[PDB]
């Protein structure tokens, strides 16, 4: 009875695997064997932002590549100057278990959310002095993992209830709900043009979504354990997944299969964060073994290590102009590098 | 000097922010943060009621505050989360004293596996668990006047023969004490099997009418603090 439908689902899996195999006769490395290696990349902690009491789950850059928001489990959103090390704002949260923070692309707003299932929107550029709460977005049944502003009125929030949700900030009501993953969703990455976003979850699968209706375009399944971080390539035709099987992998949307895996035997801890630089030649991944590794995204070898953190690296970010990378960490310190 | 007047008053702003961050750091370190774990059968909510007497629809975490002797405790019961917990449990690596509550009267091997997985979890090591072997009364009626036995679901209990008890309750029947000790021993076997020194488990025999559960967290907590101070003052 029902086993007929499940067997036909297995046959659909078989045909999908056959198609993905037939569209590949050469790996990324063969096509990019003759490209010049990046050499050794050395990056030094130019600034060090301190002031967070507890571990830092998330940081998000501003679009001006100078402002920076970070969330910490003491329950602070702090906004930094990151040129000078000044604290532009220090917002206290109502729930001190925030897993994510986002900074509006205009620079007007920050959202944090976290283990309270609500995405709180904070208004920075108020005519009034203090940063007050725009609204709370309460429609998720599991902790918020990631949140990204599309604009001042649309934010995509990932959750531990296995669903991503698109919101309308004026109304506070879900414009769309994305409901494909079986394991809870850990990271989120809007496309460069904000027509799509990839989503990595605790089912070891990444899903490409279309944020116009709310249906999954593609599913990418190459990892072994659950996927902790995702990030589109600058192009928008690829993305890198930072997983818990101690690997990073590059998937591309158009071929729709894995391109390379960025792994080395010495690494036996999970990835916590990924980021590309500006040209996508340089994938930066944070690890549980306390130090970010810089990956040549086209050779698949390490070139450079951001080893300066006492605890695990919980977040990463490259500036929109690419001048800097900031790494937060569970030791409660943010470091800017160049 | 080499920065304008705008930069000056910006730095005055950042320093005024440091002043508030320091006041909050003084608030944040004098408070002890307890993660309360447990199952559906465990009297977890009743223990929370016990500290409340001692002290919003889809809320994803709960939070109760109590103080024992001028020390602020801050207990984080988990609310509307899903069944899987290998991610949101990492948020509690730097808490004092996970408070694990189990249903003693029994499902008990499920509690043993929960304890074993909390204990051996990276990012949850270095946290000392405080077992509340709950529902002791129900365990008494289940053993002393019951057909259900611990010999099944746990074959190595027929050959148990209680160790020399220090000072049980006078009303406790030898069999009641034997089972009550076997269950606690069953948990402490996991506790001592892998957590060498950075870990302690503080078992207790608590009931639904137990009005000393707040103090038994204070004493354990005090002792968990003392071990941390011993390692950070280089005294050990």
């Amino acid at each position, epitope marked *: 009875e029902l086993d007929q439908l499940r067997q036909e689902a297995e046959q659909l899996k078989n045909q999908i695997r056959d198609a993905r195999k037939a569209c590949a006769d050469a790996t990324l490395s063969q096509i990019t064997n003759n490209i010049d290696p990046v050499g050794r990349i050395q990056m030094r902690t130019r600034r060090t932002l301190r002031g967070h009491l507890a571990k830092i789950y998330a940081m998000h850059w501003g679009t001006d590549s100078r402002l920076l928001v970070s969330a910490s489990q003491d329950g602070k959103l702090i906004i930094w100057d990151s040129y000078t090390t000044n604290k532009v704002h220090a917002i206290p949260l109502r729930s001190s278990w925030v897993m994510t923070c986002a900074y509006a692309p205009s620079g007007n707003y920050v959202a944090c959310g976290g283990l309270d299932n609500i995405c709180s929107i904070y208004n920075l550029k108020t005519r009034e002095g203090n940063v007050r709460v725009s609204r709370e977005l309460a429609g998720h049944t599991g902790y918020l993992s990631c949140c990204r502003f599309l604009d001042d009125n649309q934010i995509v929030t990932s959750s531990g209830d296995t669903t991503c949700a698109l919101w309308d900030i004026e109304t506070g009501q879900q414009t769309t709900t994305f409901t494909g993953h079986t*394991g809870d969703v850990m990271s989120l990455s809007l496309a460069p043009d904000t027509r799509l976003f990839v989503s990595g979850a605790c089912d*070891a699968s990444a899903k490409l979504w279309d944020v116009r209706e709310g249906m999954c375009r593609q599913t990418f399944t190459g990892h*072994e*354990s659950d996927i902790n971080a995702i990030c589109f390539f600058p192009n928008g035709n690829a993305f890198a997944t930072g997983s818990d099987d101690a690997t990073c992998r590059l998937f591309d949307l158009r071929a729709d299969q894995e391109l390379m895996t960025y792994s080395h035997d010495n690494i036996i801890c999970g990835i916590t964060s990924v980021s590309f630089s500006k040209s996508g030649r340089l994938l930066l991944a944070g690890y549980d073994d306390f130090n970010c590794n810089v990956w040549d995204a086209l050779k698949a070898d390490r070139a450079g290590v951001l080893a300066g953190h006492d605890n695990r690296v919980s977040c990463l970010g490259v500036t929109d102009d690419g001048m800097a990378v900031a790494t937060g960490s569970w030791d409660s310190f943010l470091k800017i590098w160049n | 000097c080499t920065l304008s007047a705008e930069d000056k008053a910006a730095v005055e702003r950042s320093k005024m922010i440091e002043k508030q961050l320091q006041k909050d750091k003084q608030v944040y370190r004098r408070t002890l943060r307890l993660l309360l774990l447990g199952a559906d059968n465990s009297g977890k909510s009743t223990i929370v009621k016990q500290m409340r007497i001692y002290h919003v629809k889809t809320s994803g975490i709960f939070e109760t505050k109590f103080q024992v002797d001028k020390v602020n405790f801050h207990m984080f019961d988990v609310g509307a989360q899903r069944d899987e917990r*290998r991610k949101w449990i990492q948020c509690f690596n730097d808490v004092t004293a996970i408070i694990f509550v189990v249903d003693s009267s029994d499902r008990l091997q499920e509690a043993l596996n929960d304890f074993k997985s909390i204990w051996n979890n990276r990012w949850l090591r270095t946290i000392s668990v405080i077992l509340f072997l709950n529902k002791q009364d129900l365990l008494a009626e289940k053993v002393l006047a019951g057909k259900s036995k611990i010999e099944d679901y746990f*074959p*190595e209990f027929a050959r148990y023969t209680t160790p020399e008890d220090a000072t049980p309750e006078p009303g406790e029947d030898p069999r009641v004490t034997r089972a009550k000790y076997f269950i606690r021993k069953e948990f402490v076997d996991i506790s001592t099997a892998s957590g060498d020194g950075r870990h302690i488990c503080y078992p207790h025999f608590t009931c639904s009418v137990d009005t000393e559960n707040a103090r038994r967290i204070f004493n354990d907590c005090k002792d968990i603090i003392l071990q941390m101070n011993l390692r950070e003052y280089n005294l050990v």
Partner: nanobody
Amino acid sequence: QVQLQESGGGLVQPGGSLRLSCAASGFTFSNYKMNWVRQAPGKGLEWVSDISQSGASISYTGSVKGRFTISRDNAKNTLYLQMNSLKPEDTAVYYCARCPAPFTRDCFDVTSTTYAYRGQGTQVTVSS
């Protein structure tokens, strides 16, 4: 993609010896502490056997002590469960579950109503 296909299962008599199997693909097998979990009808999942990464540390639920044996051939990517003297109460559907993350000694939420690195399962029945 992480696959775990169980084998075995059937209608053994109350006392018979029925051997389960578990083909595994899509992950490097040797690095995970795998499990056996079963779901007796009308009840939630319970954990049964807990073979380690290399076959060293092994644990059982009390009710299957001595009766059940777990092995794993990391070269054949396969998990096993030797069921003997199958008393007429362990007639559950039997799932082959996996550790969430490699290089680890604990298994969070393996018996979760939702878990993703579990298996389809197999059924065991008794009395006929």
